[PDB]
Design a protein around this ligand. Structure first.
Ligand SMILES: OC[C@H]1O[C@H](O[C@H]2[C@H](O)[C@@H](O)[C@@H](O[C@H]3[C@H](O)[C@@H](O)[C@@H](O[C@H]4[C@H](O)[C@@H](O)[C@@H](O)O[C@@H]4CO)O[C@@H]3CO)O[C@@H]2CO)[C@H](O)[C@@H](O)[C@@H]1O
Ligand SMILES: [Ca+2]
Ligand SMILES: [Ca+2]
Ligand code: NA
Ligand code: NA
Length: 481
């Protein structure tokens, strides 16, 4: 099984309401290129129509109720999403729903709340006496009413907020009688607080409600799994329990991957430990290695790609990726893998045996930000690498990370996939050649570069070795003609 995830959105897509229809219409294309799952953007009403989805106003409004100036979300209506999902399912493409449960944004009304300021660099330090603020904490859901859920939110379901509406002041406010949740990331002392109204996962009605919404959401969209947002800001034991709860209620596997944003393998290992390895994480350290290689012009030691990553230590729990909606140009975690290196990074995640790779909408189709640093559409460069995964990346792997610039790996093929087997080379510097073992069972075959970057044929010798070539700053992936 070479499962391939696709993140089916980018930050700057137009707010025209056609995204679910686009997905529906792309399902044939996705299936043909070996995509077996899609992570869809948050499907519920944000703070406005053009919310990318992380505002999280109303978790039960999937583009169904007239709230925040619109019925549809940015992406379309509930029915359009459901039509896209049934089209994806008709081609055996799993659908992972984005789960934004750190906070709620865009409350319907303010409440007077007693609060103290905390230090934004050290949220365990209180920096004021008690003061009365007006906080956006009251959620009534006037367009929805009680349809699907009569749960209403008030200040006492939250630990704090970043805005006092009476003084018009952006500070971090912790509400009276509240405490930041733990365990969370210990950056800035305690990183429970991120944005909007921060949900209090010490509150038992909150833990109950978010669990039952989880089950509701899975049922409503027939989800096959989840993508968990911003998990370093959400009580770890709660996330663990939430994942088990929805699995228990649905009776489905519910593959789950969490976005724990830290370039630190040890912090990710800690998160995995505290959630009992019941779900995966995005391989954030690998992303940063790709970013670094792509900006150092050949000076990066390409041997380092094998160490310090989630996929190197916990391959079963790694979702590997090149870029996402936070790392793309202009976004809050900007660390974009430069255009020239991006196909090499894709070869790395797509054709190697370890990890569950994810391709980025923004990489395939380009990003539509207002800058001139936008990622170009690289679909045509990635397609042959996807085909390499789908048809050729099977069987025993041999690594050649034995050079500062030119590194490679082979796959011997497997008898259960006809003509499978590949030989990949990437280089962040000058090109050249590497002899690599592809398996004696491929002796005498004529192999060629599926990317078309190199036009030479390589005949595998009797001992199972081929002499493979790669251009400067390029990738070649040889497979049987
Ligand atoms: O309809 C399409 C397919 O849907 C189903 O496949 C699912 C699996 O059920 C999910 O569990 C998941 O598979 C992941 C797996 O969870 C994850 O751990 C990872 O495993 C890799 C591992 O990273 C790697 O190091 C190496 O050991 O190989 C493992 C897999 O061979 O990646 C898996 C996907 O490659 O998602 C898929 C859908 O993408 C269903 O069971 C299939 O029958 C169906 O075709
Ligand atoms: Ca939080
Ligand atoms: Ca709390
Ligand atoms: Na909290
Ligand atoms: Na190098």
């Amino acid at each position: 099984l070479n499962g391939t995830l696709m993140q089916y959105f980018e930050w700057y897509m137009p707010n025209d309401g056609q995204h679910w229809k686009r997905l529906q219409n792309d399902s044939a294309y996705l299936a043909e290129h070996g995509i077996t799952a899609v992570w869809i953007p948050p499907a519920y009403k944000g703070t406005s129509q053009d919310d990318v989805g992380y505002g999280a106003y109303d978790l039960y409004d999937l583009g169904e109720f007239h709230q925040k100036g619109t019925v549809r979300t940015k992406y379309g209506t509930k029915g359009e999403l459901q039509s896209a999902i049934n089209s994806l399912h008709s081609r055996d493409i799993n659908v992972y729903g984005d789960v934004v449960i750190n906070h709620k944004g865009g409350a319907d009304a303010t409440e007077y709340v007693t609060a103290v300021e905390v230090d934004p660099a050290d949220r365990n330090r209180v920096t004021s006496g008690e003061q009365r603020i007006k906080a956006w904490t009251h959620f009534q859901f006037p367009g929805r009413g009680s349809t699907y859920s009569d749960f209403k939110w008030y200040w006492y379901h939250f630990d704090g907020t970043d805005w006092d509406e009476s003084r018009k002041l952006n500070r971090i406010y912790k509400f009276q009688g509240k405490a930041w949740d733990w365990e969370v990331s210990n950056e800035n002392g305690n990183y429970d607080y991120l944005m909007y109204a921060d949900i209090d996962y010490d509150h038992p009605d909150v833990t109950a409600e978010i669990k039952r919404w989880g089950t509701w959401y899975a049922n409503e969209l027939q989800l096959d799994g989840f993508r968990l947002d911003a998990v370093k800001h959400i009580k770890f034991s709660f996330l663990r329990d939430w994942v088990n709860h929805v699995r228990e209620k649905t009776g489905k596997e519910m593959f789950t991957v969490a976005e724990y944003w830290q370039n630190d393998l040890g912090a990710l290992e800690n998160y995995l430990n505290k959630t009992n390895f019941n779900h995966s994480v995005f391989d954030v350290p690998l992303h940063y290695q790709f970013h670094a290689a792509s900006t150092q012009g050949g000076g990066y030691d390409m041997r380092k790609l094998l160490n310090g990553t989630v996929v190197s230590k916990h391959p079963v729990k790694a979702v590997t990726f090149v870029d996402n909606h936070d790392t793309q140009p202009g976004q809050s975690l900007e660390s974009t893998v430069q255009t020239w290196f991006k196909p090499l990074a894709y070869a790395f995640i797509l054709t190697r045996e370890a990890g569950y790779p994810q391709i980025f909408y923004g990489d395939m189709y380009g990003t539509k930000g207002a800058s001139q640093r936008e990622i170009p559409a690289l679909k045509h460069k990635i397609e042959p690498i996807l085909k390499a995964r789908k048809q050729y990346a099977y069987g025993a792997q041999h690594d050649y990370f034995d050079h500062h610039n030119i590194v490679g790996w082979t796959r011997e093929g497997d008898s259960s996939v006809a003509n499978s087997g590949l030989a990949a080379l990437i280089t962040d510097g000058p090109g050249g050649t590497k002899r690599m073992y592809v398996g004696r069972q491929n002796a005498g075959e004529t192999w060629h570069d599926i990317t078309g970057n190199r036009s030479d044929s390589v005949v595998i010798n009797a001992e199972g070795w081929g002499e493979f070539h790669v251009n400067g700053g390029s990738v070649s992936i040889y497979v049987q003609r």
